[PDB]
Design a protein around this ligand. Structure first.
Ligand SMILES: CC[C@@H](C)NC(=O)c1cc(N)cc(-c2cnc(NC(C)C)c(=O)n2CC(=O)NCc2ccc(C(=N)N)cc2C(=O)Nc2ccncc2)c1
Ligand SMILES: [Ca+2]
Ligand SMILES: [Ca+2]
Ligand SMILES: [Mg+2]
Lengths: 207, 142, 254
């Protein structure tokens, strides 16, 4: 046992998509508020979400400073003022490395143009939370060659649906004259084992 | 929207789904392949969470699966860009920007102070030596 | 100091060497021209209270140069709560009989305000520890001042990352852990009383005093330092006090 009031936060989890990273935890405070601290293995601790009653804390602005670094956060529980229980109680979060763990966002097919017997499919680059002096960097700007986009396309008279892959944001596939095709794209970081693919983009078809 | 006569028109994804909202079967009849229909259904039937325009203070919402992402303007942060960075000037936040000592003043702006041997500069945050050998400085490096 | 580096001459200007009857006793930290902060346990066996000397501007124990200044220690103030033989409240405030002269080689480390130290300095990851102590656990002491960079840990972490030992001192609110648990670097016997100095926006402050440990640089263990922030008030009040006739003074704490 230790001090009177307050309980330590638990189940710290990282919610991250295209680098928009939010730390979430339990439980819903009762006569206690929280403050979050985050740091790289060798760097100083930076406080965020000061005395918040929320059970989440946006850490985006800190991690986009270097998405490849490995961050650790911890959540402190303070007794609501007077309840000074008769160092503060805290809990560490799992380590988190943005570049290797952030979820790849849902892509969007920007357009598709017919060119005789071939079809070009363009993926709109996805904006990420990483900034480059006034603008938001794209998934490709951040991952470069580590990022590829996959395309699923099918006819209607087809029986299986084919796939194509690209190192850019454009596909140039061979199609059958006449027939109308349907497409769906997916972001992928092949060098990943877990979370290596984004959710599929809305389906688009030539009508 | 299926109302006798419209149904005479040939199955069109665009007309039965993008303009009239389809159900799962109507869409599958059009796609024929179940995995194809799923693929289409995951997003179509997910919902536009950005509809509640959740990103505040000029933020930009981008849809995701059962969620969304908010892109905030420089002076804001938070899942919904609700946090005003300009309202966090408190001592527990990187020492309130003070070079040495920071004193919080609820109701008003925090102030910065300095250790004996130093004095506050016009900028209200920096400290400068008032003696030849202030504490905490290494002369041979300085 | 185990696994550190030689602190280049004049770069650890607040370091103090305490001697008794001419032999090296412990390290210390100059906080102004007449007061030196050290560790209380360094004085458990003193019999000749009048033979206490503080040397500033020292570097190479094997040779004297014109930068060293020696001063008689007129008073040794330790908290009454401190118990000889133990580790809690391991701090001593020393009054030099005459003030030292501030020079390029002799400068005080800033003693910080309590709030600033608890809310800001406590979160600066790395800090420097120095001394002429043992270069290895139970090894020989250093001739040239040694210094080491060590990361600070909150006690919960220190306790969770340390090998359990059936009988060992409690880590109290008056202490904090800093160092490495991989047996590679640490402060050691002979470094006691020396500073744990923290750099913050252009200025160095006193955050800790070399105090104790399970041996030195022992796998599964960290150095333990006196948490200076808990004594700021006690130190300032005492520095305003009028001298006693006797040297040792056990002052009430808080
Ligand atoms: C030189 C002055 C002399 C009269 N005083 C003492 O010997 C003395 C007086 C006291 N009240 C307490 C002590 C004392 C008791 N028990 C200790 N460790 C436990 C875990 C076994 C202990 O670390 N001390 C203090 C001490 O030796 N200080 C020197 C010191 C400072 C820093 C570190 C470190 N960061 N790793 C290690 C050591 C150290 O040498 N510790 C040890 C511990 C056990 N056996 C040999 C050496 C020692
Ligand atoms: Ca959605
Ligand atoms: Ca010398
Ligand atoms: Mg239309």
């Amino acid at each position: 046992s230790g001090t009177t009031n307050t309980v330590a936060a638990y189940n710290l989890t990282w919610k991250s998509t295209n680098f928009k990273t939010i730390l979430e935890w339990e439980p819903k405070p009762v006569n206690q508020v929280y403050t979050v601290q985050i740091s790289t293995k060798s760097g100083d601790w930076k406080s965020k979400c000061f005395y918040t009653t929320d059970t989440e804390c946006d850490l985006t602005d800190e991690i986009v400073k270097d998405v490849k670094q490995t961050y650790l956060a911890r959540v402190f529980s303070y007794p609501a003022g007077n309840v000074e229980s008769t160092e503060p109680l805290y809990e560490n979060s799992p380590e988190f490395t943005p570049y290797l763990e952030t979820n790849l966002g849902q892509p969007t097919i920007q357009s598709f143009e017919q060119v005789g017997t071939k079809v070009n499919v363009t993926v709109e680059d996805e904006r990420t939370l990483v900034r480059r002096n006034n603008t938001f960097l794209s998934l490709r700007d951040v991952f470069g060659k580590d990022l590829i986009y996959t395309l699923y396309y099918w006819k209607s008279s087809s029986s299986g649906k084919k796939t194509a892959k690209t190192n850019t944001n454009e596909f140039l596939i061979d199609v059958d004259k006449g027939e109308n095709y349907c497409f769906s794209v997916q972001a992928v970081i092949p060098s990943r084992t877990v979370n290596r693919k984004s959710t599929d983009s809305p389906v688009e078809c030539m009508g | 929207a299926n109302a006798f006569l419209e149904e005479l028109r040939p199955g069109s994804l665009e007309r039965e789904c993008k303009e009239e909202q389809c159900s799962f079967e109507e869409a599958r009849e059009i796609f024929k392949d179940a995995e194809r229909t799923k693929l289409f259904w995951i997003s179509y039937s997910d919902g536009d969470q950005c509809a509640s325009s959740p990103c505040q203070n000029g933020g930009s919402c981008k849809d995701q699966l059962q969620s969304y992402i908010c892109f905030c303007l420089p002076a804001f942060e938070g899942r919904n860009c609700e946090t005003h960075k300009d309202d966090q000037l408190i001592c527990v936040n990187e020492n309130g920007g003070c070079e040495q000592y920071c004193s919080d003043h609820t109701g008003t702006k925090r102030s910065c102070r300095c250790h004996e041997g130093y004095s506050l500069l016009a900028d209200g945050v920096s400290c400068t030596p008032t003696v030849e050998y202030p504490c905490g400085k290494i002369p041979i490096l300085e | 100091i185990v696994g550190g580096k030689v602190c280049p001459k004049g770069e650890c200007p607040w370091q103090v060497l305490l001697l008794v009857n001419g032999a090296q006793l412990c390290g210390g930290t100059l906080i102004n021209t007449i007061w030196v902060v050290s560790a209380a346990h360094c004085f458990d066996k003193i019999k000749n209270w009048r033979n206490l000397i503080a040397v500033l501007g020292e570097h190479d124990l094997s040779e004297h140069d014109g930068d060293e200044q020696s001063r008689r220690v007129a008073q040794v103030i330790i908290p009454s709560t401190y118990v000889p033989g133990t580790t809690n409240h391991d701090i001593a405030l020393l009054r030099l009989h005459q003030p030292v002269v501030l020079t390029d080689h002799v400068v005080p480390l800033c003693l910080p305000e309590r709030t600033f130290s608890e809310r800001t300095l406590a979160f600066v990851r790395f800090s420097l520890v120095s001394g002429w102590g043992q270069l290895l656990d139970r090894g020989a002491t250093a001739l040239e001042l040694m210094v080491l960079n060590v990361p600070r840990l909150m006690t919960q972490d220190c306790l969770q990352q340390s090998r359990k030992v059936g009988d060992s001192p409690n880590i109290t609110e008056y202490m904090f852990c800093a160092g490495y648990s991989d047996g590679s670097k640490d402060s050691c016997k002979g470094d006691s009383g020396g500073p744990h100095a923290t750099h913050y926006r252009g200025t160095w402050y006193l955050t800790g005093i070399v105090s104790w440990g399970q041996g030195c640089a022992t796998v599964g263990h960290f150095g333990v330092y006196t948490r200076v922030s808990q004594y700021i008030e006690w130190l300032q009040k005492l520095m305003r006090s009028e001298p006693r006739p006797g040297v040792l003074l056990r002052a009430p704490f808080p």
